[PDB]
Design a protein around this ligand. Sequence first.
Ligand SMILES: CC(C)CN(C[C@@H](O)[C@H](Cc1ccc(F)cc1)NC(=O)O[C@H]1[C@H]2CO[C@H]3OC[C@@H]1[C@H]3C2)S(=O)(=O)c1ccc2nc(NC3CC3)sc2c1
Lengths: 99, 99
Amino acid sequence: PQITLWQRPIVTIKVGGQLREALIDTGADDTIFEEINLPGRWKPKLIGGIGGFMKVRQYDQIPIEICGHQAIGTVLVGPTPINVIGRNMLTQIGCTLNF
Amino acid sequence: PQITLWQRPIVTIKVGGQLREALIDTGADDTIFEEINLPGRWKPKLIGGIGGFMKVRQYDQIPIEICGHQAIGTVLVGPTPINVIGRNMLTQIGCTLNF
Ligand SMILES: CC(C)CN(C[C@@H](O)[C@H](Cc1ccc(F)cc1)NC(=O)O[C@H]1[C@H]2CO[C@H]3OC[C@@H]1[C@H]3C2)S(=O)(=O)c1ccc2nc(NC3CC3)sc2c1
């Protein structure tokens, strides 16, 4: 779809067998969710944002469905105030900005 | 223009008579710059992001040029790790997401 920006660009996600909502976030390099339970090994990572840093778990090669489009890639799990779909996944679904 | 997401979507800005670069950030409600000097009255604001909160100065009705497009609106000034153009300005330049 085309999505305008009058409201937060929130879409429906399936990840790890669970359903969530997440913000299409062109300012995010990576994809971050709070309150998901992913399988297998992970690696602790510190990431920076406004406000400072956040410890996350880094999971690699995770399948995700983003508004009906399939992608796989790294998902970070940690205390973000809103789930975000970052460019690592957006590039796989052909998402672009236009003005 | 159309902008893909293989790299950070950074554009050239003029704000307060000064030239800067900033990220087109659909995950940002508001527009934030570090290291700009805006004229006139402002109001202290705490904003949240990953990592926690950040104190900013809130300036209203600030003209900005974003990749050659004119907008006016609220600009927040404070210690962000990267300057961001948020939806308050993106809607005025007709920016949309597409996939
Ligand atoms: C640069 C920064 C913009 C990136 N963030 C993405 C922005 O879109 C976030 C999304 C957001 C919204 C709300 C919220 F509670 C928390 C986050 N917006 C945000 O803080 O907005 C703030 C601010 C703007 O006005 C209002 O709107 C929401 C809120 C309020 C004040 S990030 O979440 O820090 C992030 C994401 C992925 C990522 N991947 C990395 N990988 C490492 C480098 C290789 S580092 C990294 C850092």
